[PDB]
Design a protein around this ligand. Sequence first.
Ligand code: FOM
Ligand code: FOM
Lengths: 375, 374
Amino acid sequence: MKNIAILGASGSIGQQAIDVIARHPESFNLISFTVGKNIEFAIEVIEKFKPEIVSVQDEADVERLKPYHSNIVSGRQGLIDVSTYEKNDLVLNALLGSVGLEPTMKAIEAGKNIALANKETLVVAGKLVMTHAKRYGVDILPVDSEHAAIFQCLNGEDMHKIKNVTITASGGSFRELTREQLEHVTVGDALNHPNWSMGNKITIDSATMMNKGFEVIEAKWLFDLKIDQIKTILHKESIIHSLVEFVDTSVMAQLGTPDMRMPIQYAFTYPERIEHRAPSLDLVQVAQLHFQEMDLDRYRCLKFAYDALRIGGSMPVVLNAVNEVAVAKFLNHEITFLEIEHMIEREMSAHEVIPDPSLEEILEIDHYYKTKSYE
Amino acid sequence: MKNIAILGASGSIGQQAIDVIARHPESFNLISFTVGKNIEFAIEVIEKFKPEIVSVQDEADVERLKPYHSNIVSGRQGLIDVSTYEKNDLVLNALLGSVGLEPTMKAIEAGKNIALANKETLVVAGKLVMTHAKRYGVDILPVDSEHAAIFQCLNGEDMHKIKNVTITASGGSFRELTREQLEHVTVGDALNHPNWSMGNKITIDSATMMNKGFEVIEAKWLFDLKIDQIKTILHKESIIHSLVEFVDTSVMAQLGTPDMRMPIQYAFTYPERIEHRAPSLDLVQVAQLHFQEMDLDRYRCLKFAYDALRIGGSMPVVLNAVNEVAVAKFLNHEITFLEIEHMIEREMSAHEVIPDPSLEEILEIDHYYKTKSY
Ligand SMILES: O=CN(O)CCCP(=O)(O)O
Ligand SMILES: O=CN(O)CCCP(=O)(O)O
């Protein structure tokens, strides 16, 4: 048996990881998990999976759960408790935004392997989080279409012989608009995403191209690449999930239907793969696959991400913190769509960067930008 | 450092590998090489690399190369001593035809890693060379954009967990035509394809899809496959060279330029890779990749290889030898295009079928069908 911890269990990635657990009672177990605010979901999981400890993200909800369960934690500590439980053999982080940083930190400290779906952990503190993995003898296991993809293409490969990697972008809801028309998009239209869903924050990030920019950074720390090693390309159908090129011009791609359970389960069964009872990718049905050169004028958020990469230090913490606040304000009909872009540029032009932020200053800056006034 | 040996050196592939040796003096030297035919090329290749043993076709030619160094051989035995030169570390078998079979086999026994550029040996002696390769503790690598893909896809994986394999197809010169319009086809419109480069025999195989039939049979033995795996798809751009799917549903693939210096050089370096100075694959310039189902009514030649595979034994040897003569004759205007599909079909249906041939059966069954009357 492997004992699995799910951090973001009430989310898209978390749900899909519970199905995987529900498709393999023989090899997996759900030992601990975390929700936020979807308490009905928690009761369903507790009455099916028999987990030992559950954490809510708000204390008032503890006693809605206390009949069904006895070991109920809550809040900030409730996260570390569920990610550091000693019966944990593997921790899956499906939290969004930097809320997930601190628990993987404390989980690593406890010598526990990490399947990492939470992107911004590596965006705000990649290099901090990696050099912590070495030193505790724990590995970081990507669970994210684009990065699970790169990962499998490197099996039996010397990472030293990578020329570049290319990360594929679907282009989000507004891929067939020019900025001119973007003055006119509603929240409803932004939420109607092409290829996956995945929840609302990822859907807007995908339309902003922040999602890919976050992943170009995550990829720099996973695979130890340079800025010129990271390319992007626009792939409408989202079949090819990424591709790496080696110094001998051989190029490797991984393919699938936009379904997250495969990368999740491989991150549970590495380096063995086991059967996944689901329809296979039928290249004959898809008929054709498109590729267009990335446009950095149409998606300036991907240019900011590159810029947060080449400045370094604490600039990535700001790009993430303000994006978290800009996307929330957009979904609450507080700002317009192109506002997300302009909000981000401001705080970055002003940021006084810290070269090698420790954890506490990273969590500091992130707090400053999430509670600052945007007027 | 590795000392390489090339058997079909005057050949198209043997020369591209000579370049792949010449770009990397830090990793390769050519220690021994074989040539029949072209004696000129030998002298230009002796002067550069000064290798330690040579073979010619005809002992008649032995005399012209006495003055350029000492250790020269010829004939059937000639091929063997350069195959099993104890200074070789990897031996590239580049001579197309039934001549490739025995040299390879003796090189396996001398314990030499083999690079297989001869499509013949694994269509015709698959179970043989493979069981012997496992017997003598040596691996067969592929130069071949198709099988070098599979090799790179499975690198770092448990072959036990393969679902399918899918080799990719361009469809030859007549992809856009129907078997009805191919009553009107000529030898000149058969060769209007990018495979035109040393494709005289290979373009025809591409036009009839014998070419990929041949590689599903090689795949079956090289990667220990069952027939229900090994699928095939029409991919017009020929950028994706092959797909592998695992029991978890994941799908790997290798994509590339149409440059055979790439697999050649990967073959040489097997676990390693190392720098190949050519233009990379720009995916934004080939805007799309197309994918149509394989139609076995439309390419009866492809069913014929799945047929030869379904039976086993000596039946694949009949396929290679007859397709050889039927393709050869079509080019001499002795035979019309659709006949190749018929000429093979008749001989196949009539063939007697030996269950587990040995080398000499295989060689004799090959000779008879190449030289009989049609
Ligand atoms: O793990 C999945 N994603 O990060 C979403 C990929 C979609 P896109 O590049 O359009 O956002
Ligand atoms: O061995 C020959 N080839 O790999 C040439 C590929 C062209 P085809 O795709 O139609 O087989």
